[PDB]
Amino acid sequence: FHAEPLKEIDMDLGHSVAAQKFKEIREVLEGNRYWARKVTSEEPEFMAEQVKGQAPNFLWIGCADSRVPEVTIMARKPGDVFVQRNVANQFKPEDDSSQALLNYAIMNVGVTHVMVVGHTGCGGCIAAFDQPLPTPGGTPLVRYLEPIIRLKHSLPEGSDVNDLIKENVKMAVKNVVNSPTIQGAWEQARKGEFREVFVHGWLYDLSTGNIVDLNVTQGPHPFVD
Amino acid sequence: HAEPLKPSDEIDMDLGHSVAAQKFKEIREVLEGNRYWARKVTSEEPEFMAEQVKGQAPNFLWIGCADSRVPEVTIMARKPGDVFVQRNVANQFKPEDDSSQALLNYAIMNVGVTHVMVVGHTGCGGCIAAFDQPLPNPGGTPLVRYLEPIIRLKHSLPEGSDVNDLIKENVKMAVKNVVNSPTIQGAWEQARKGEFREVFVHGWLYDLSTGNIVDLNVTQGPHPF
Ligand SMILES: [Zn+2]
Ligand SMILES: [Zn+2]
Questions:
Q1: A11: nearest CA partner in chain B
Q2: Which residues of A are annotated as a binding site?
Q3: Structural domains of chain B, with CATH
């Protein structure tokens, strides 16, 4: 919603303790100062429009991996893409976090397209790839990765890391589709009570920089062409 | 002598694989933007793709909000490979979640990050939603269940406190939660024994009015000063 202008809060980056002690911190904050000056002057109305609220058309459900920033790789702007990022782009149906996020995207800010986006070189999948099925689960990671481990064990023999990565996107897509939020949106949309919303599964290919559609899109109706 | 196909033709052909790009101009637009981006990067930076294929070594972990107006890489003028990211509604880091705890630990132990920034933002709908709420009859929709700690926080703040006050305190609460994490504790105790690099936690506030990131100066490291 509506941002109220700010107000001890101190804007001069000369007064940031960390920026005084760490070059890398100063660099990033100075990067931000320069970004803001630049944008303020090439689109004086940008900051003003964004203070009013947000209307992203997309929700990106993606991985924490530093190589996969959604706005850069989709060449978008702030305000285009509502985002969840966690390790190995999971959307667990039991998770309040994820259901709250998905419901808010769709019902409160007006998202139309939901993309689950995996990527090659995904350490979550690479790590799940050589685990045994749980009886119970070593670390927070192995436990968190349980559904991806189970998934690995349902793959045809000779399947590689990229097959796991791909099926993990499709599994997240199914989890999203089976949420109350989307099932509810689709029930309404079918009857013309709500806009149609779509869930997509994509894979970002680190070797090319290209997003590849895995074509597992679903909407309120049979999605064929 | 034979000329390559022009980029726009190659891109149209490349996107033929995507059913949805054939159905939604919005989707085609984002996949075209991506392809133009990837072409450019590959041309200006012939070995970007090569290095990112090999692995990642970000110095930062960003713990931020899903809000579409707050993409970390854009507003800090960074490149892919610089920032490992968690994004959820209103930038929570719940100490009992395996997902957050696994992400944090993976970032420090596996990925090698040195700085963890909790970043809140003005106009935060997560905070604005928890400002209105009475207290846990134990939570009437999963958003309310997810915003409990912020709902709690809200009721502890002095009378006349506004949204921006809650947003700031939410960052500090999150920072407190990360610091109290087993991961941070065990990096800090290990570091004080001169066995691990020092890792630091910061609290930032992104001001949508100006585009500036405010350091709230709540940085913690293994030692004071
Ligand atoms: Zn990943
Ligand atoms: Zn927010």
A1: B214
A2: 63, 65, 119, 122
A3: 4-55 (6.10.140.610), 59-225 (3.40.1050.10)
